[PDB]
Structures are given as C-alpha cells and as structure tokens.
Write an enzyme that holds these catalytic residues in place. Structure first.
Site, PDB file in Angstrom:
ATOM      1  N   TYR A 186      -0.556  -0.889  11.016  1.00 31.57           N
ATOM      2  CA  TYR A 186      -0.665  -1.008   9.569  1.00 31.57           C
ATOM      3  C   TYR A 186       0.586  -0.472   8.872  1.00 31.57           C
ATOM      4  CZ  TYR A 186      -2.915  -1.030   5.000  1.00 31.57           C
ATOM      5  OH  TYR A 186      -3.236  -1.277   3.684  1.00 31.57           O
TER       6      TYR A 186
ATOM      7  N   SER B  76       0.847  -1.190   0.000  1.00 30.58           N
ATOM      8  CA  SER B  76       0.000   0.000   0.000  1.00 30.58           C
ATOM      9  C   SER B  76       0.881   1.239   0.000  1.00 30.58           C
ATOM     10  CB  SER B  76      -0.908   0.023   1.234  1.00 30.58           C
ATOM     11  OG  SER B  76      -1.750   1.161   1.228  1.00 30.58           O
TER      12      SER B  76
END
Lengths: 231, 232, 231, 232
Positions: free
Chosen positions: C155, C142
């Site tokens: 994350y 990401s």
C-alpha cells in the site's frame, strides 16, 4: 570491521553496487555479488572482490525480474551464511520516453527491478535478521525518489515507492536491531555543486549506515546530490 | 584526521555539542568551545577537550542572543586560526507553552538562539572558507525541523527556519568547496519506534562523517537521526 | 459548471470515487463510472448519478488489474466522448501483513490497482487532453503517500509511487493546459482533529482542483488528514 | 458566503492580500485591511473593498515590525467584532544579497515581518476563535517555504519558519474547530514549467476555498501553487 558479517548487494557487478562491495570487503565481510555480466567480467570482478575480503566472496545471477530466482539467492544465503547481515538494493534499469508513448512492457520491467525486487529481496532477508537481532538494509534510490524529471515516469515512480517501502519496513522492524534506509545520489559518474558524485563517495555513505553508530538512523533517506534537492 | 583544521562549536560546554567537540578533538582539530556555564565548569570542560587534541583548545563566551558578541568570536577565530574550517551550530533553548500564553519575551529569545545565531555565525565563517576553498557547516537542528508538536511553537519555527537557511547557504556556496547540512536528532539522552534514546556519541559520529572529505557531495540537506520518528 | 466536459473516475461505485462522481454530475459533466459491484448496485448507482447530470452517465467494468481492459475504457472514451477531460484515479485495494509474510500475489495485486493502473489510465488520457489543450488529472492517494504505517508495505509503496508519477507527468504536460495532482486523505468514514473526513469534503477538493482557478496548481499533493502529517 | 464573519488581512493594501480581501468582501465578510501606503492610497483601497462588502470595511496601520502595534490591532478587532474568524498573514519583505554581505539590519527586518509577525498575529486571534469553536488561519508563504535559492537567505529561513509554525499551531488547536494552513505561491504577477505567471485572483480563489466549511479537515499543511516549481 565487518568480520563474519554477510552482505548481499544486488546490481553489484559495476558502478555503485560494485564500489559498495569493495568497501564492505576491505572491512572483512562476506559478499554475495549479483547482476548482468559476461562470464569474463563476472569472474574478473568476483576474483577482484575476493582478493579484498578475508571472508567468502561469491556471485549469484538472479534476474531481478524473476521473483522466483530472487528467492533462490535469498534461500541460498540463509543456507550458506545463515542469513544476510547487510542487504543493499542497487539493481536498477531505466528508460526515457514521454508517458503517452511509454511501452507497457518497459513500465512493468522498470517496476520489477527498481521497486518490486527490493520487496522480494527484503521479505527474504528479514527473518534471519530478526532472529540474529541485528541488520542493515540500504536501498540505493536517487534524487528522483524525492523530486521528478520529465519522461522518467516509471523510474521516478519506483524511487518514490522505494521511499515508502523503506519507511514502512523500518517501522515494522524498529525494535529488532535492524535499520532500513535509503541513499539518493545525484548524477554519479541540476547539480549546484557542478561535480559528479563518485561511486567511492556513495560507498562511504553505505559504509557509515552499516556501522553500529548509525543504529538510530532508520526509515530515512540520505541525499547526496550536490545541492540538487536543495532547490 | 582533522589536524590543522579548526572547529567552532556553539553550545558545546555540554550535551551534543560537547560530544562533537570531543570527537573532532580526537581527530587533531583545534577547537573553539562556546556556551553557558559557571566559571568552574567552563575550565573543567575546556581542559577535558584540550587533553584529547594535540592542537589548541579554548573557549569563547559569546552570548548567542548578542550578535555583536558572536561577531567578536568570529573575528577572534579569523585572527587566531585564519577562520574556522568546520562550523557546527548546536546552541538552542526551549520553552513549552500554548501559543496564546506564549511570552513574546520567550519567542524572541528562542528565535535568536535557535535561528538567528546561525545566520550571524555563518556570515562570519563563509569568507574564510571561500578563500581556502573548503568548508563544513553542520547545523544541529532536530526532528522538529521536519514535523511539529503542540506547545513548541518558537522551537519548531526556528528548526524549520534553520532548514531553509541550510538549503539557501548550500546553494550560495556549492561551487566554493563548502558544504552546508543539518542533523535532525530525535529524543537524545542529555514517538520513537526504536524505543531507545539517541546517544550523544551517536549524533557526534554523524557529524564526524559530514566533516570528512568523502561527504563533499552531501550539501543543503538534512539527516534525521530519530529512530524512525519522522517515518510516520 | 462542467458542461460538455467528460470525467472518468476509477473506483467510483462507492465511497470517495462515488462522491466525486455526484459533484461533477451536479455540475453538468458526463461521467464514466467504474469498479466492482453487483448488477443491482451498478444499475442503482449509475441511475443515481445519471439523475444528477444533464449530460451522459455510464459505467464501465474495467478490472484495474488488466492493463488490456483499462485500454478498453480509455479507448471507448476517446470514441464516445472524444477523450476524457477529467481523469481521477480512485481505484484502490489493500492488505495488511508484516512484510516477511506478505503474499507475493498480494504485492503484485496491490501495485496493479494502487499504482500501475494510474499509469495505464493516464497514458491513454493524455493525447486527447493535449490536443484539446486542457485537462485535469487527480489521483486519490492517502496520507500513506507521504508517511508510513507498519504492515502496509505494498500500500504505502504504491501511494509514494503515485506521488512520483504525479510529479513527473505534471512536468511533462505543464505547457498543455493539463494539471496533474494528488489528494492525500486521512481516515475517511493519528488524526489530531479527532474526526473522520467525509467523502463529501474530499469531493469538494476534487471539484476545486478541476476549476479553472486551479490551473496553476500542478504536480502537487493536497493533504486532507486533520493534522495527521503535521506531525 | 461569509456574512457576519470577520477577516483580518496583513499586507492587503496591494497584491495578493488585496485580491484576497476583495474575494472575502464579495462573500459578505467584514474586512480589516493592513499595510504600507501613502494616506491617499490607503483610503482609495479601503473604499474599493468596502464597495464590495455589505459589512464593515476598515484599515489598521499596525507596523508588522512593532509587535505592540500588532497587539493593538488585534485588540481593536476583539472589541469591534469580537475577534477575527479568518486570519491571513500576507505581510512580507525581501532583500537579495549573498549572506556574507547580508546586513544584520535586513535579516532582522525580514524575520520580523515574514515570520515573527504571524506569531504575534496568531496569538491574539486564537483565543476568540477557540471560544467560538471555529476559525481559519491562512499563512501566505511561498514556494521558498519548501525549496531554497541563493541570496534570499532571510526570506527562505522565514518561509520555512512559517511552515513549522503552521504545523505546530494546527496541532495545538486541531480539536477547537480551527484550521491552520499555508499557501505556497510561485512567481506571482504583482523555474516554473508552466511558463505562466500565477495571478492574484488565482491565489485568492485558493484562500477562499480553505476558509470555507468544506476545508475543515485540511489543517497544518501547505498547498503549493507554483505551476510545478517544487515538483522538480
């Protein structure tokens, strides 16, 4: 100077973490040491740093692999000193082996010390820093937090994560007088400079990022690798 | 303490460069100022800084677009002080406009001052530093050396250019006792989560550190001072 | 085409991982699916991908939080197919909260799926890939693997680690016909492009990095974020 | 399939640019070649490529150092094809020498071809692409756009410059259906853990992908093809 300020430095019983402890002590801050060490060595070093700081120096033996024990140090600090004013993460373990033969035990262990510990250590330090409206978090990473080397997967993986951890937290606390930064040293006693970085140098950088002049430096990493990453 | 040490600083008649010229002056260094400004201003500033340093302070009018003039200032330094010990590139211009309406005239000017001038500046400084076995080159770029923004095409390409130049020259001189780095400030009071302006004194304190002996193992790298700008 | 080749795609029961499965199936590869899903949904999707691949499609339910279960899938693959030829890691969980209030349970969980699982998944896939002298490992990260956002610490930390994991492994296996890469998407259905990236697009990139033309692309990340990281 | 689509490609009379001109030609695109070479060679290559494309293939002699000539080639494209749909910058020169002995003459030349030429090239391409609501700009840089090396100062500064330019222009045109990226090859067969030369066909396949419609959400970024070079 750093009077009344309290510094918590994981992995500060030897090498870099220790060098940092000595400088922040010369500047009059309270120092909480931490890490592996024979009783003889723990008392030697603890009394050595004590004899530098006008403030209070004391050692805490939290195993960075035990998130519960880490909370202990973080809690005792809130009690004793009313929150850590400076938090530097220097605790780090290593293991070299090609991935397909990398002990899962070793992976989980390396991530615990090199990454997750900084999490537990930061999540505990933040609230008092916010309240006080000032703070300095300095993660000791490595060049492998920017670039890689073979057979050091878990290690590399953790330093890169520490990068991201730094970037996030820094954003979270930008408006609270707290800065979160990382230092990425090279070979400390590939390097174009052909010389070892000395723990004393690495320390001077830590000292700087702790000053009020480095208030506008946050969420970033400072490479001290003698030209390692320059290529 | 920079006693005996000589510092050349481009674009130091104001703003960041001036703050840095002052900091180095308080430390004992001889300073060579450079930059735009009416005659009245040039001498006011030159005194201001002189008043701080126990060493020699003077100004050179080299135009950062005219490399031969840069060459002369560099030559004058070698003769007067036997070469700069510290060299900081701060000269820079701007021009905001979407690229298809961006004047060639302006692209050429920004590139000359923001990128090429450091080339010409460094080329004349490297030999003396090499001979003395010590040196400090500090290129004042911007957060735009890392990330971009619309309508600052020449400015952004130039900063990114300085990045590569810094890395390169570092590698070339890594074993000669010279370091070559970049400071990447954010919005400075002459996209920031910190919601505070970077002060010129702040930036100058970072310069002062990199010039010190401790910062000998910091080379070919950048240090962002953007209050978080680049972290996102 | 991708005939006889076998692909293992964690988190491929929905969204991106699934989109990737469909393309590698259209190209004739065997596909091992994986991930959360009601029985009804697992059979629907499994039969859907099956009806695309001339080869063999089958689902394995290894919980990415159980390193022992992951070994199962990795082992059954060596048995059934003689090693995975393509390994894409897409399994990912999330949780948003400011660090000082971030459940330690959630931290450990996010690191397990978003980071450590790729480790267990890769350490198992490598040997057969080395022997066969060919391979493709593609980690779905990401934009937060390059830049950060507040309240997404665990994350962010994991995507950055995945970066480093990729860089290392790629170096380790450079001379074996295996490439290890990462794809960093933006908002898939901050972005200057003002449009969602579609799972079909993300898939096309995966398909490319799997081709023989992308043999010389290794240890790198490909950002598809519509200009997100460009600033 | 790029039928109807027009591609301008600088420095395509050989090497990477040529490989890419060929790839796009097999896909149906009109091609505008550009670059150095004796007359005999120019026409040999122009036929070679023409023989692949069912569209128009021709060559323009614009000198990447003379922006007005770049301007004319860009103008000719707008008139002949109504503007380039695809634009790849591959023109580049080199000069190895430590910076203090690096000829100003040479710094100026490398910067002009390796950095400034893409500015002039892009400025003339953006308007037509904007009008049509679709576009592809692919700057062929190098791994030197990411990391440096000694004695390639002008080359390295230029590649890093292209980086910033790419980012910027991407942001400027993100909402206009245009993408702007960079390919960063390693040692190509015209520091690599892979111990294999990057082939021109390989690089061209990456270009072909970024030109496709799928790669619409890839913009303002770089893709290293260095067999691992930059991973360390």
């Amino acid at each position: 100077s750093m009077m009344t300020k309290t510094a918590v430095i994981t992995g500060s019983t030897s090498g870099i973490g220790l060098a940092i402890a000595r400088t922040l002590a010369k500047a009059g801050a309270n120092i909480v040491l931490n890490g592996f060490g024979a009783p003889d060595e723990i008392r030697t070093v603890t009394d050595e740093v004590a004899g530098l700081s006008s403030g209070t120096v004391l050692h805490h033996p939290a195993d960075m692999t035990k998130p519960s024990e880490i909370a202990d140090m973080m809690a005792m600090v809130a009690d004793r000193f009313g929150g850590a004013d400076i938090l530097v993460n220097n605790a780090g373990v290593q293991f070299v082996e090609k991935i397909e033969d990398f002990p899962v035990e070793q992976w989980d262990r390396i991530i615990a010390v090199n990454l997750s510990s900084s999490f537990h250590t930061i999540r505990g330090a933040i609230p008092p820093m916010k309240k006080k409206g000032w703070g300095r978090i300095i993660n000791i990473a490595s060049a492998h937090g920017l670039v890689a080397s073979p057979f050091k997967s878990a290690y590399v993986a953790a330093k890169h994560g520490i990068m991201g951890l730094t970037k996030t937290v820094a954003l979270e606390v930008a408006e609270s007088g707290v800065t979160v930064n990382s230092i990425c040293p090279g070979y400390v006693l590939g390097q174009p400079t052909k010389k070892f970085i000395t723990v004393e140098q690495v320390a001077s950088l830590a000292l700087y990022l702790a000053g009020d002049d480095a208030a506008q430096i946050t969420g970033t990493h400072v490479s001290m690798d003698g030209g390692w990453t320059a290529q």
